[PDB]
Each structure stands twice: as structure tokens, then as C-alpha cells.
């Protein structure tokens, strides 16, 4: 049972690829040490291929089947509808990868006659053929990072043609948005805004007599997912009340695509064969979450960890429980790891028990504290700012499809670093370019959105509350981490940012309107004599419903 089989053909690039950060006046005003930032390229693919190609020995036991039982029962609750081809098309991102069969994402969102007739045909074929492998393309993924303390290989993206992706949406969008919540309840991480997630963690932590927690990183999770795993997911999906055609398409998608298939490079050559999770299908986030939850829940029972609560987001897992002592927590964690390893979810970083909630990193994030205007304590979500700042420098130098910095400002608005640096840097640019009013693409939980910078104040208030503009007195841990990171990257110190912010604020106020409102609210931290901020009228009435329903990483999803 090998995760991958290779022919010798290479993972080829489609364009030329940049590795180094472009020395640029703007970039440099944010980040001086440009030689610490790199982007992944095809050149490192051979290395990723070695990490990722192995034989999986999986062995299931009583605990695993008792848990599956509970999950299938909860899935039986669910009713899911077939998306009409119209709806599926409008879910396609405008810059999605074009079809091999003579049309692109625009034609799809336009319901162009050629696109829709092809999609219809792909569907017909799905209904009638449940065994012929569906072709997937494989690419080296391009992401920027900062150089390691103690260098990362490109990740491998694997995805089917555009026509197939629209068919996935028709068959599975509703399922994939609705099921995980029903199946995992409050453990489903993607139903929560960053604030809600924090409330969950802190409340869970406080309900324990003596709390112990840990995160669990499994090594190359997609690599470890077996064909049996994928079949189990399918059976969970089939617990829904589904339209007969939906059943047929889902079965066909699982058998022809999800469990495996042939790998084709950009130059049309066969690279090999996959018998594990594809990173770029609609089900990869839902599927990872379910599978991770299923293995982790059973391992928790094997380990006899007591009063376990867990939170799961794709391959990311954190559990909080009652401590039974130092030496026995330690031993239980080894028992849990041995169970995951048998279930074919071996560890990357060996896991260690933590007794301070602030020290537990999950989704690269962690909970912290500050104080609002009234001195009241406020918990909020933060993370190490290294990657976000690296990517911010890159996006300052090279325009880009996805604007990570915008996603980061939204998700991490209350943070010390996103306020003083990210907000300040990017508003001064927009200001000078004069593109305040222009909408930009970012992503949130994998899904893509188009967002107007001048709407940031309403958005932030709605997601984080008014205190997000008044936080101060951050934790020692946060302050030190951030401080140490600016020194690391050659980022100008926070007193400089405060100075640039005063000026950006003044210019925004200058222009009145929504822009002055950005000035008032986003930059009040910057002035000595602070303003009383009162609730925004346009916030109390925002459609933020569909923002935190599910995860869609690699799912190719776009919202209005």
C-alpha cells in the first residue's frame, strides 16, 4: 500500500518561478533582511517527493469502530441538496485554472454555452461510469516563508480539470458545508470566528479542575490517509438524505478521484499514481477533519485520557483534558501517539503536554490576553508574525492573486502586529496609489472573497467587537515574541510604525466619509489623546453568516 508511485518524469513548472525576494524600495520599508525570505519552487519537488512516498501499515481496533458508529449516527441527521449547475458555476473563483477542453473560469461564471455543455457531459459520465480513473494534474506549490532557525520543500498540489470541479460542487458543496458540524458538534473548528474559537478554548480550559492540553502534528497528513480512510469518509457522506443522482456522483467521485488516480505534469507526461488524499479536491478539508477527528477520538479512549475535549480543523488537532499528574500525562501522551501511529497517523513533531493555555499552538495560532478601554480583560487569537510579515513583504513587491495581508488583517485584527504594522503599511500604500475604493481578493478558511478596504472597520467590529480598536497592555509573551521577530527580520521598530500611522490616520480623516471612519477606528491606538469609539451603524447589519460555516482549502470556492 504505497502512498505514491513514480515514473521518473519530473514535476514541471508552468511559468518561470521566482525564489528570492525582489529588492524593492517599498518592500524594504517594511522588511530590511530580504535574504531571509524565499518562495518554494519546482526545484525542491524531488525532496518533497521523498518525504511523502511511503508504505502505510494501518490496523483498526474496537475503539475505532465504536467511534465510527457514533459518527455515522450523527450524519444520518443530515439532508443535503444537489446544487443546480447555475449555483455551482457562481461558486467558481474568477481566476480559477482553465479547463483543458477549451474554456476558462470566466466562461463558467458567464454560463457560456461551451462550458456548461461540457460540465453537463462530465456529470453524465459520472453517473454512468464508477471505475475509470479521472486524470489529475500535479504541481509544485508556491509559498513564501522565512528561513528556519535550525529550508522547506515545495508542497505538492494535485487537482482535477475545471469541469470536474464544478461537478464536485453540484454533488458535494452542501454536504461538505453541513455534515462536519453535525458529525463533530462543537469540536468542528471551522464553524467559529476567531473570537468564538477563543471563547471555546478559554471556556474549555476553565472547566477543568487541573487543565492539561496538547497539539498533535501528524507528519504529511495527506500522505498518511489510506484508501480505507477515504472509503470510510464516503460511507459517512452516504448517511445523508441524498438525491439518487447525488449518490451516484458521490460514489463515482470517490472511486474515480478521491481514493486515487494518475498524476500528470504540466508538460502532459505521466508522473505516477496516487493512493492517498489529493490536496486540491472539494472534499480534502472535510475529509481530513472527519478522519483526524475519528482517529484522535479513538486514540483518546485507548490512552485513557480523561474528560477530553478536542478541536479539529482539517489535519490540525488540539485536545484539552484533566491532568492526572505530570508523569502520567507524559505516559498517556505516548499511548495516544502509539494509537495514532497504528491508525496510520504518525507524529511529525513529538507532542508534549502543556499546562499554560497560551503556550498551545493550534492552526499556527494561540490564545492571549489584553485589556480594552475600560481595563477589562479580553482574550483574542494571535500567532507568530514571521510568516505573515514575510508574505506581506512579498506581496508589497509582486502583486498577487491572493492578498494574504488582507486575510491577516481581518482574522488577526485585535493583534498588536496586525494593527501597528500590517494596517499601517497597507493603508499608506492604498492611500498613495489611490485605490482605497478598489475591492481585493483575500481568503478566509480556504474560501476566496472580494473585499473593499473601506469596509474594514464594520467587518472588524462585527467579528471581534468594538474592543478590537481599544486593546492595550498586551501579554509579556506576545510583546517579547513580536519584538524578537522584528529584530529577526529587519522590520522597523514599533515606534516608527506609530509615526507612519499618525500620518496615514491624518490623511484618512482628511478625506472624510468611509475613509475618515477607517482613520477614526483602525488608528485610534496611534494617537496620544484617544477618542471614545461608539458602535458603527453599518456593523449592526452585516451579512457575516456564511463566513464561518466550513473549511474549503484547495476546494476552489468563491463567495459574493
Of 417, 367, 368, 363, residue with least CA distance to 392: 417
Of 165, 147, 199, nearest to 31 by C-alpha is 147
Contact 275, 262 (CB under 8 A): no
CA atoms of 481 and 489, how far apart (whole Å) = 12
Whether residue 315 is annotated as binding a ligand: the answer is: yes
The 8 Å CB, 24+ separation contacts for 122-126 are 122/163, 122/164, 122/166, 122/167, 123/167, 123/170, 123/249, 126/167, 126/171, 126/248, 126/249, 126/252, 126/253, 126/256
Name every residue whose Cβ is closer than 8 Å to that of residue 261 and which is 6 or more positions away in sequence: 133, 134, 135, 136, 273, 274
For 151-218, the three-class secondary structure string (H helix, E strand, C coil) is CCCCCEEEEECHHHHHHHHHHHHHHHHHHHHHHHHHHEHHHCCHHHHHHHHHHHHHCCCCEEEEEEEE
Q: CB within 8 A of 448, min separation 6: which ones?
A: 93, 402, 441, 442, 557, 558, 559
Q: Flag whether 356 is marked binding.
A: no
Determined by: X-ray
Going by C-alpha positions, the residue among 56, 165, 265 that lies closest to residue 558 is 165
DSSP for 273-330, written as a single string: EE-S--TTSTTHHHHHHHHHHHHHHHHHHHHT-EEEEEEEETTEEEEEEE---HHHHH
Spatial CA neighbour of 423 closest among 394, 463, 453, 401: 453
384 appears as a binding residue in the annotation: no
Q: Using an 8 Å Cβ cutoff, are 262 and 273 in contact? A: yes
CA atoms within 13 A on the CB side of 362: 27
- Are the C-beta atoms of residues 59 and 525 closer than 8 Å to each other? no
What is the topology classification, in CATH, of domain 280-360? Alpha-Beta Plaits (3.30.70)
Here the cell at position 382 is: 494571535
Please state, in angstroms and rounded to a whole number, the distance separating the CA atoms of residues 253 and 250. 5
Axis-axis angle for helices 62-75, 284-303 (nearest 10): 130
C-alpha cell belonging to residue 120 = 453537463
Please report, for the chain, the start and end positions of each structural domain, with discontinuous segments joined by +.
1-55, 56-279, 280-360, 361-560
Please give the distance of CA 343 from its chain centroid, rounded to a whole number.
24
CA-wise closest residue to 202 among 214, 211, 193, 189 = 211
- What's the length of the chain? 560
Burial 335-346 (b: 16+ CB within 10 A, else e): ebbebbbbbbbb
Q: By C-alpha distance, which of 150, 322, 299, 326 is closest to 216?
A: 299
**What's the CA gap between 433 and 126, in Å, rounded?**
49
Query: Is the distance from CB of 194 to CB of 381 less than 8 angstroms?
Result: yes
Final resolution, Å: 2.7
Amino acid at each position: 500500500s504505497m502512498s505514491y508511485t513514480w515514473t521518473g518524469a519530473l514535476i514541471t513548472p508552468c511559468a518561470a518561478e521566482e525564489s528570492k525576494l525582489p529588492i524593492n524600495p517599498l518592500s524594504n520599508s517594511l522588511l530590511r533582511h530580504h535574504n531571509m525570505v524565499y518562495a518554494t519552487t519546482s526545484r525542491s519537488a524531488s525532496l518533497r517527493q521523498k518525504k511523502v512516498t511511503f508504505d502505510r501499515l494501518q490496523v483498526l481496533d474496537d475503539h475505532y469502530r465504536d467511534v465510527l458508529k457514533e459518527m455515522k449516527a450523527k450524519a444520518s441527521t443530515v439532508k443535503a441538496k444537489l446544487l443546480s449547475i447555475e449555483e455551482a458555476c457562481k461558486l467558481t473563483p474568477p481566476h480559477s485554472a482553465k479547463s483543458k477542453f477549451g474554456y476558462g473560469a470566466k466562461d463558467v461564471r458567464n454560463l457560456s454555452s461551451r462550458a456548461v455543455n461540457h460540465i453537463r457531459s462530465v456529470w453524465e459520465d459520472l453517473l454512468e461510469d464508477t471505475e475509470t480513473p479521472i486524470d489529475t494534474t500535479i504541481m509544485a506549490k508556491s509559498e513564501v516563508f522565512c528561513v528556519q532557525p535550525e529550508r522547506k520543500p515545495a508542497r505538492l498540489i494535485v487537482f482535477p480539470d475545471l469541469g470536474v470541479r464544478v461537478c464536485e460542487k453540484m454533488a458535494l458543496y452542501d454536504v461538505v458545508s453541513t455534515l462536519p458540524q453535525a458529525v463533530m458538534g462543537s469540536s468542528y473548528g471551522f464553524q467559529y470566528s476567531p473570537k468564538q474559537r477563543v471563547e471555546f478554548l478559554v471556556n474549555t480550559w476553565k472547566s477543568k479542575k487541573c487543565p492539561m492540553g496538547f497539539s498533535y502534528d501528524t507528519r504529511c497528513f495527506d500522505s498518511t490517509v489510506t484508501e480505507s480512510d477515504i472509503r470510510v469518509e464516503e460511507s459517512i457522506y452516504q448517511c445523508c438524505d441524498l438525491a439518487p443522482e447525488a449518490r451516484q456522483a458521490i460514489r463515482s467521485l470517490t472511486e474515480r478521484l478521491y481514493i486515487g488516480g494518475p498524476l500528470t505534469n504540466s508538460k502532459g507526461q505521466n508522473c505516477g499514481y496516487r493512493r492517498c488524499r489529493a490536496s486540491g479536491v472539494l472534499t480534502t478539508s472535510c475529509g481530513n477533519t472527519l478522519t483526524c477527528y475519528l482517529k484522535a477520538t479513538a486514540a483518546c479512549r485507548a490512552a485513557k485520557l480523561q474528560d477530553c475535549t478536542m478541536l479539529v480543523n482539517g489535519d490540525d488537532l488540539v485536545v484539552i483534558c484533566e491532568s492526572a499528574g505530570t508523569q502520567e500525562d507524559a505516559a498517556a501522551l505516548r499511548a495516544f501517539t502509539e494509537a495514532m501511529t497504528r491508525y496510520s497517523a504518525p507524529p511529525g513533531d513529538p507532542p508534549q503536554p502543556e499546562y499554560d493555555l497560551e503556550l498551545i499552538t493550534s492552526c499556527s495560532s494561540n490564545v492571549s490576553v489584553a485589556h480594552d478601554a475600560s481595563g477589562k480583560r479580553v482574550y483574542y487569537l494571535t500567532r507568530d508574525p514571521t510568516t505573515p510579515l514575510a508574505r506581506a513583504a512579498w506581496e508589497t513587491a509582486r502583486h498577487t492573486p491572493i492578498n494574504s495581508w488582507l486575510g491577516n488583517i481581518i482574522m488577526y485584527a485585535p493583534t498588536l502586529w496586525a494593527r501597528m504594522i500590517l494596517m499601517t503599511h497597507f493603508f499608506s500604500i492604498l492611500l498613495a496609489q489611490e485605490q482605497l475604493e478598489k475591492a481585493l481578493d483575500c481568503q478566509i478558511y480556504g474560501a476566496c472573497y472580494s473585499i473593499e478596504p473601506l469596509d474594514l472597520p464594520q467587518i472588524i467590529e462585527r467579528l471581534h467587537g468594538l474592543s478590537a480598536f481599544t486593546l492595550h497592555s498586551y501579554s509579556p509573551g506576545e510583546i517579547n515574541r513580536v519584538a524578537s521577530c522584528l529584530r529577526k527580520l529587519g522590520v522597523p521598530p514599533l515606534r516608527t510604525w506609530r509615526h507612519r500611522a499618525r500620518s496615514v490616520r491624518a490623511k484618512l480623516l482628511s478625506q472624510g466619509g468611509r475613509a475618515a471612519t477607517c482613520g477614526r477606528y483602525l488608528f485610534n491606538w496611534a494617537v496620544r489623546t484617544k477618542l471614545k469609539l461608539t458602535p458603527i451603524p453599518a456593523a449592526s447589519q452585516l451579512d457575516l453568516s456564511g463566513w464561518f460555516v466550513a473549511g474549503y482549502s484547495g476546494g476552489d470556492i468563491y463567495h459574493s
